[model samples]
Target: APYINAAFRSSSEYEVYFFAKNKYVRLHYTPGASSDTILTNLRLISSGFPSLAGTPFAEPGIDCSFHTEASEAYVFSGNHSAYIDYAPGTTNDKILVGPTTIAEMFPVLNNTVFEDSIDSAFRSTKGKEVYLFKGNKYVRIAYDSKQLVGNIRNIGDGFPVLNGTEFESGIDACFASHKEPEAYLFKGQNYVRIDFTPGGKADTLVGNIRPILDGWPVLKGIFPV
Candidate 1:
């Protein structure tokens, strides 16, 4: 399977985007459907997002991305960050902010481990913060202030639910669910779901790690068998 570079659900939570190194795919979701339908085949990143075409953010893939309640998505690539203005179910969109360097896009991360890059990120369903993960550690950023909520901590220590799991060391991508207080973490060819509370001691594992295709069958033939 192709390593997921980043993923995010639409504001309505019915459309999911999975990004790989040079391409991206969209999944159309129905609340009670047996499974999601692949909206499009693998499309080059440079040709998928209209606003990003011909821009630096369109090539070489993105590092991480997160969707906010306000219908915005923040994407990171290398040491740069950009915001996209989108509606609940729209596909074609425009870049509202920039492909500016992190130094200008996210000053809060300046001098921090995440100042340069992050493996994945998601806005907590709790409504107050966003989590940024890199390697084996992560940090929380206050949604309102865009400031670091706490010091960088090990992923296992912060998300007790992930301790002892392969995901404890690092993750390839992640996305928050709009329907529940949960997040999907992906690594290699496997993925897992967890109902985690930020800064809290306990969390619930939605299910055990499983093949990525188990939950996302539509992606079956996207990569080699």
Candidate 2:
């Protein structure tokens, strides 16, 4: 029953971590390469993420995650959030800030529906914005300021391109592409490459939602949702 519950892109454009219930895998993506070459074997979250030990994220697993800096990440699980710092490819890591309520972690979101939980999140390629999604609603916040950038809006209203698409209701996970002004949004077993423009919709859909396996074949048998 393992599936990607969350994901985050590493400092390296080719690197991405896919998380499931109790385990996760690091993907070194190479477009057009066969599946076997791109993925690292799954590692138990409790064992590999020492920073998550003794925290809610250790067993239940991460709900969503995003990075503002190369060595830092803000991870969420259920209604709680934590700030983690780590050295990539090594075991050295620790929680620097919290296991606090999302409302407490980002007070700006207080009283909003997402103050309790969110479906997914990712940093924007533009400026210092980060987008948080929940239900069919989404909001943008300045990564450093932690201040709401604008009024919350429905996904369809915010991204007209997704209005009649499967992604309109909500998304499971989204991670911005380091090499381009775009993001990969996942829902169920399908994923779409969205041409991202902060605060607005893309001129057109970048690609249709295709089976996750088509893009990440390594997850085919190992992490079927």
Candidate 3:
């Protein structure tokens, strides 16, 4: 069988393991580097090496070793890592056997705040009007019938731009709340937006609005308008 080479490389971010030709190995790496250069290597050796004989080998089928920069090699005894069965068309030639590290298997490192902060910000603005700035547009938050209200009606004719072009039309605020805000826009009522940040309780803010978050269409990394 000709299996595709889908193992990790030197550019990944998290842990990655390679299983091929009835053998497996794990690649370790340093944190936060642009690439996962090989820091060390571990190999698994098979016991009672397979031969033409039809009799299958007993358990304990693999072992390992490591080599250092000084050209010193140290062997370690062990099992044959793990085995991954490939399709009928897979071939060992197609199997990838090479240097791979942890960094390439995960998302790039980021200084992003967790959902907790966003949740806290949301809870701080419950029942209060606020502005949600997404990209170049700003949506207004209001209150109606004890629930939040988010209509797209423009508050003023238009805002003046330093470049002379007037700012695009936006919404109005009924009451003011000095708190961080998060919102989701939806079609209807001239593209009404919903405020998920209410009264700034991080948990409740996200808890009460999970549906809106889940319903939002994700593009690249940004959510829907």
Candidate 4:
């Protein structure tokens, strides 16, 4: 019969045994000793075998396998398996950078009249410029400083010249600058409107202007992800 000698023994009378084939191994602990308790405490000194018959392989759920780089060992659970990264300073969450503003994400326009005035207003206030309304749908500005200034009029009455159909009515008339040609309209009291030149970076402008409007009661823009 082939047999292997114990490599080491602990004060608790735990011994690590190796098989003659050098492929099988087991831990011989004191009689009547709690296997789990011994495994938990002895793990610091030796590697132990724990079964993983039923556990989540690499997903988030009960019965998951956990590992630590320092110990290079895996743990299995009887009640429920859990996966934990023994590696410290690991983050699993969303990180937001800069400002998440509406104008920074979507910058497009339909009516030049409103667009020009909006651009001028933004520029005068040192507001970030983020969009241009080059489309044919004329945006009607109901300028009532008391009631609200940036309310969107009904969608323009005519279709875009390029498309040659009735202009899309409502707030949807504007277009996106960076991703698509979609646009957003602000319908609120005390809001800032933005306009851009024919060729410009609307997204950048919106991002810059977002911080300025933080405390305002009403402001609107398309959000970029």
Candidate 5:
């Protein structure tokens, strides 16, 4: 029953969600909600967060997640999913569609890049590739600003040297310092730091996950119950 009080945000992504006793609600940012009405009603597409009761959870089953950066939401129901993007200038303003395949939602996972849950991730090799690790296996996501997301596959299967073959599991999650040249891999009470430069490995291992994660604002690391 306490599950109804849960909430979460999508890491390295733009999304947030709040669980409910009987339904789920999601909050997405819509900068455009400033000028449009039919598309951005004061209630449905307003430029702000209204009273909680003003936004009731009318739907009962779908779970909502926010995509923070672009102000989007992925509402998942059963095995299917849909996206709630800001009211489009044209027909693309779909509040809900019917399908967002497993690959689209998690390309590396559906591709079986690591065959496990993503434990931690970082922008390794000078941001040339984005690495997602799990159980010693990892996936390298080619970085492209215009594309944001590019080729995704196992590191050992695609780029072995920069891969996470040297790192094993038992991790809760990870994060990289965007302003500094450091990266961290967290596993329970312990964490490992790696140089942000290419060919860098877990050079230093120490510290508790609590204080480290606390220092980073908006760092959402989930632990199992």
Candidate 6:
């Protein structure tokens, strides 16, 4: 119980898990430092774990989502008030919400306001908005200078029935392709293609692709219960 604070992998704040060189890559998180700056500042001021032979945390790191309210505290999801800890609250505002490509999600840690779990989340098909979910309810957010503005919306508002049955956000993982106009929602051994037309038209449910993907292999056992 006492070790969870220092165990970076166990905490949702870091979102990484690993052991190296026959020793735990224990993290030392002091306040006023983020996963990005915290480690570098630590190594700069620290003896740096003689156990790892003074390897700098900066020696290797994949980009993490922008650090924000969770920068020092081990909490998650801050609705629309989150931002990159490195920013001056205005720099690169468009990059956060208007990325040219899809799936270019923020590298910021804890931008979302979700609780213990993130049920399902993805960027809007147009790549103009990010839909972060907590349950059937979702918060659509965009960069707004100092404060990111989040508008809470429901999954059902956009996606209607599936297989002539109502859709469930709790059971579905939704996403879309950059080139395609349709959206894919997957749930419990089955999936449905939603052909949602542009300019506000009816969305069609192309039911049950479980058989369509029956020829696929790598997909086997990939969907968790």
Superposed Cα deviation of residue 215, candidate 3 (Å): 32
Candidate 1 residues 106-215, lDDT tens each?
Answer: 78888877777888988786656888898899888875677787788898887677889988898888888765777888988888877776667245565688888767
lDDT of each residue in 3-115, candidate 3, tens digit only: 10112211222333222223333344322223432222323222112220121111222122211112111111121111122111223211121111211111120122110
Task: Return the lDDT, model 4, position 106.
Answer: 17
Q: Per-residue lDDT for 107 in model 4?
A: 30
Q: Write the per-residue lDDT of candidate 2 for residues 84-104, one digit (tens) a residue.
A: 875687878888889899999
Q: Best TM-score goes to which candidate? A: 2
Cα lDDT computed for each candidate against the true fold: 0.77, 0.79, 0.22, 0.22, 0.37, 0.32
All candidates: TM-score = 0.89, 0.92, 0.16, 0.15, 0.38, 0.39
Q: 2 or 6, which is superior by lDDT?
A: 2
Distance from true location, Cα of 195 in model 5, Å = 1.5
Predictions ranked by TM-score, top down?
Answer: 2, 1, 6, 5, 3, 4
**Tens-digit lDDT string for candidate 4 (1-225):** 212111212222333222111122224433222341213221211122222112321111111111112222121211222222222123321112111121221132222233222211111111222221223323222111212224333223222221222222212112111212222122211111233332222232221112212322111131110
- Give residue 147's lDDT in candidate 1 (0 to 100): 77
Our model 6 lands, by Cα RMSD against the true structure, at 15.0
Residue-level lDDT for 191 in candidate 5: 42
In model 4, state the lDDT of residue 92.
26
Candidate 6 lDDT over 145-204, as tens digits, reads 222234455556644553234344542344433324554444444544566553232364
Give Cα distance to truth, residue 46, candidate 2, Å.
Answer: 1.8
Worst 10 residues of 2 by lDDT: 30-39
Tell how far residue 29 is off in model 2, in angstroms.
Answer: 1.2
Q: Which candidate is the best by lDDT?
A: 2
Q: Report RMSD (Å) for each prediction in the order shown.
A: 2.5, 1.9, 23.4, 28.7, 11.1, 15.0
Model 6 CA deviation exceeding 4 Å by range: 1-115, 143-150, 162-166, 197-206, 209-215, 221-225
